[PDB]
Amino acid sequence: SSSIKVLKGLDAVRKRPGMYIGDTDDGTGLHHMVFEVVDNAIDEALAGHCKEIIVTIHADNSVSVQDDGRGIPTGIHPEEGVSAAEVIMTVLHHGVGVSVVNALSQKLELVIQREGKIHRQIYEHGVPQAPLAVTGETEKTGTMVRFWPSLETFTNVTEFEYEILAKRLRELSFLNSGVSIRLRDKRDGKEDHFHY
Numbered sequence: 001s002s003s004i005k006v007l008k009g010l011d012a013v014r015k016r017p018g019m020y021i022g023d024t025d026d027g028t029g030l031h032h033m034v035f036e037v038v039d040n041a042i043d044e045a046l047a048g049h050c051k052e053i054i055v056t057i058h059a060d061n062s063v064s065v066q067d068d069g070r071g072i073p074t075g076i077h078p079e080e081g082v083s084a085a086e087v088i089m090t091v092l093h094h095g096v097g098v099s100v101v102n103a104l105s106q107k108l109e110l111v112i113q114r115e116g117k118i119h120r121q122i123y124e125h126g127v128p129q130a131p132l133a134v135t136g137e138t139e140k141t142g143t144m145v146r147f148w149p150s151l152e153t154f155t156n157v158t159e160f161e162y163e164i165l166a167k168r169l170r171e172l173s174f175l176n177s178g179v180s181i182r183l184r185d186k187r188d189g190k191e192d193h194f195h196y
């Protein structure tokens with residue numbers, strides 16, 4: 001039931017993205033993709049587990065958001081029969097849910113560090129290539145989401161603008177005293193640190 005429901009939700013978002021992420025021509029939807037993923041990292045900070053968020057603009061026009069929180073739970077739900085992480089990445093929940101970013105990404109990479117293991121999963125248009133898998137051991141904890149926005153969905157403004165991410169991250173750091181945000185642009189080495 002869940003599998004059918006999930007695919008219906010992905011289809012819904014790709015068919016009417018304006019209802020979920022906003023305008024797909026003028027860059028507002030595109031930048032909103034980053035801000036949704038960051039809002040999830042900020043929740044993990046607000047719960048008191050994440051101290052540092054790192055937002056990176058990569059040279060291939062993907063964006064990663066790294067937190068140093070607990071790591072999304074990885075245990076297979078008895079019910080849905082896939083990792084708790086995969087449910088969070090794929091089930092449809094301002095505040096539109098990461099499954100919307102995933103639906104509208106050509107590719108999404110999830111890396112979770114939790115209970116001494118690295119877990120990794122790759123998505124394409126919100127669909128998992130394979131179940132979440134352990135790739136190594138680690139002493140660290142946290143969640144990293146890197147996504148490549150679908151050029152089927154986004155036109156015209158397709159490249160992230162440093163200033164637009166900077167303004168919003170600075171604003172989120174003002175609203176959430178104590179959270180520390182790094183923004184780094186791999187295209188030219190620019191970086192900023194936002195903290196109130």
Ligand SMILES: CNc1cc(F)cc2c(NCCCN)c(C(=O)Nc3ccc(C(=O)O)cc3)c(=O)[nH]c12
Pocket residue numbers: 037040041043044065066067069070071072073088098143144145
């Ligand atoms: C870049 N970071 C990042 C991106 C992202 F797209 C999603 C998340 C995310 N879940 C999203 C749903 C909620 N707002 C969590 C989360 O669920 N953490 C979390 C939840 C429960 C437990 C536990 O019960 O043990 C431990 C950790 C997180 O930490 N970081 C995220």
